[PDB]
């Protein structure tokens, strides 16, 4: 390269067109070279790692539910944004991947228990009163929970949504009557129904604490959105 130049290339463009000129501008005594692409930025790789899922409501790190009835946790992105991984997902309008989820059931009492986790497909009718017989019809798993400590278990659910791509944001109504705005229940990986089971009888009703981790397989994203402030 030259050390000096009387007729150098000018460096003024136009960003109003919609795209930034990210090319390194030529300079004397300067040699700009490219760099190899790291696998860290690829969305297929980035989203394959587990991250703590915000529990519905306020985006809390944990959810407390009674051992009497249990709880139902939705796998809906729109429901996750009401609180992190949700902030990372909010950078994309539509997404489609195979969900990987790890649940943690913290048992407070001195006796062991067993958790019944059934997979309710996106679009399926969710029972009003979760029972052992009805949840067995769905794809379920019986997880042994230890006493006075938490037990972890991982699950894999493929893309089962009826939509082509699950939206993290939705400008419209779910039903034709227009009662629910900005939501799509079917646009999710479904709902996970939980029912605690005890062999012993405790005099005091206690509550289980739930923590969730989420990872994605074959992550595909469409229509980018601005990052959160």
């Amino acid at each position: 390269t030259l050390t000096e130049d009387l007729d150098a290339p000018q460096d003024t463009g136009n960003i109003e067109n919609g795209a930034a000129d990210n090319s390194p501008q030529p300079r004397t005594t300067f040699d700009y070279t490219g760099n190899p692409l790291p696998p860290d930025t690829k969305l297929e790789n980035f989203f394959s790692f587990y991250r703590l899922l915000p529990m519905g409501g306020s985006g809390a790190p944990s959810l407390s539910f009674p051992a009497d009835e249990g709880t139902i946790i939705p796998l809906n992105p729109i429901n996750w944004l009401k609180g992190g991984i949700a902030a990372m997902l909010s950078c994309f309008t539509y997404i489609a991947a195979d969900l990987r989820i790890t649940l943690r059931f913290s048992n407070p009492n001195d006796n062991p228990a067993t958790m019944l986790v059934a997979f309710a497909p996106p679009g399926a009718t969710i029972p009003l009163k979760p029972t052992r017989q009805m949840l067995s019809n769905f794809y379920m798993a019986e997880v042994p929970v230890s006493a006075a400590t938490s037990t972890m278990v991982s699950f894999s659910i493929p893309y089962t949504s009826p939509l082509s791509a699950i939206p993290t944001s939705y400008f419209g109504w779910e039903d034709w009557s227009g009662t629910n705005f900005g939501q799509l229940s079917s646009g999710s990986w479904g709902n996970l129904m939980l029912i605690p089971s005890l062999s012993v009888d405790s005099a005091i009703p206690f509550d289980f604490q739930l923590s969730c981790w989420v990872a994605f397989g074959n992550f595909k994203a469409w229509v980018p959105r601005p990052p959160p402030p």
Partner: protein, 220 residues
């Protein structure tokens, strides 16, 4: 020895997990010949393809034009609880797609004449109020005196590839495809001393492109 490390979820039972059973019968069993038994079924859709009555709609000579005789939404609130073989298959799964075959059997007299317009209107906030409003969708004006049954195809004019089977939310955009209604096009006529009424038996079955996936506990 093999150096191993247990991953989370040890001892957990799974209904979709394979390789959990241990042999509770040592000898190799041989089942008796069963090739003599007919009617071997291998798919749940075979039940859906079988006929099934959904509504017994009456029709009298006193019924004037533009008179509604029946109407039902193509949503999990109706199609999953008709009592037909197809409704049970739909209730077992969470999603469905494809065409639906409707068969309106005219069980009246051979001397009876008239027309009943069967209208299928896609998804809308409000159902059709009048006959001409229903006739703005996919319809077929059916003359009852020809062959006994009317073959009315309910097309899958849907927003998405799959429709949800959620009885709690039937009017959702990803749940209902619309409404199917019966209206009196031309009044029922016939000679004197002939029956004043004629019953129409409405059957519903699965089409050749009908499918269901993602099992669940029966919707109802």
């Amino acid at each position: 020895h093999w150096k191993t490390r247990a991953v989370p979820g040890a001892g957990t039972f799974g209904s979709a997990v394979a390789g959990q059973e241990l042999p509770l019968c040592g000898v190799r069993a041989y089942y008796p010949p069963n090739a003599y038994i007919p009617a071997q079924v291998r798919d749940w859709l075979e039940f859906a393809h079988r006929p099934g009555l959904m509504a017994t709609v009456p029709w009298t000579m006193a019924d004037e034009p533009a008179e509604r005789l029946g109407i039902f939404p193509v949503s999990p609130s109706a199609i999953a609880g008709t009592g037909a073989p197809i409704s049970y298959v739909i209730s077992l799964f969470s999603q469905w797609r494809g065409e639906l075959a409707a068969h309106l059997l005219f069980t009246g007299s051979a001397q009876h004449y008239g027309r009943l317009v069967v209208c299928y209107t896609p998804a809308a906030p409000q159902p059709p109020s009048t006959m001409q409003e229903a006739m703005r969708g996919t319809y077929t004006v059916w003359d009852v005196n020809a062959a006994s049954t009317l073959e009315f195809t309910i097309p899958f004019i849907s927003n998405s590839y799959w429709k949800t089977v959620d009885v709690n939310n039937p009017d959702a955009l990803l749940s209902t495809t619309g409404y199917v209604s019966i209206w009196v096009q031309n009044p029922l006529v016939g000679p004197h001393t002939a029956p004043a009424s004629a019953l129409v038996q409405a059957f519903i079955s699965a089409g050749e492109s009908f499918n269901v996936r993602l099992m669940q506990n029966p919707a109802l």
